[PDB]
Write a protein that binds this DNA or RNA. Sequence first.
DNA 1: GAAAGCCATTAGAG
DNA 2: CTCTAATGGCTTTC
Length: 68
Amino acid sequence: MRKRGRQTYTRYQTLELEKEFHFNRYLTRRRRIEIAHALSLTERQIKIWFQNRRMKWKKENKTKGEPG
DNA sequence: GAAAGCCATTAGAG
DNA sequence: CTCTAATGGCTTTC
């Protein structure tokens, strides 16, 4: 596993997860669980992948006005 | 009441 | 050294 041996997040997971993210960064809490089973990850990881994406996405996704 | 939500930082692999 | 994956306190929460 030459990429985050820990946890390689594979394409297929990253496919639909992107599509979800596009619609809804925020999940009402226990929707996260429903994803977690659907893709065979842990609740944790369905926070994290999205959190991680959000964090950067804020800087990236045409955020003028943003103090600074 | 423990959970996502916020975020830079903090391990963590490349 | 670079981008990612994951940690905590504060806040609401159903």
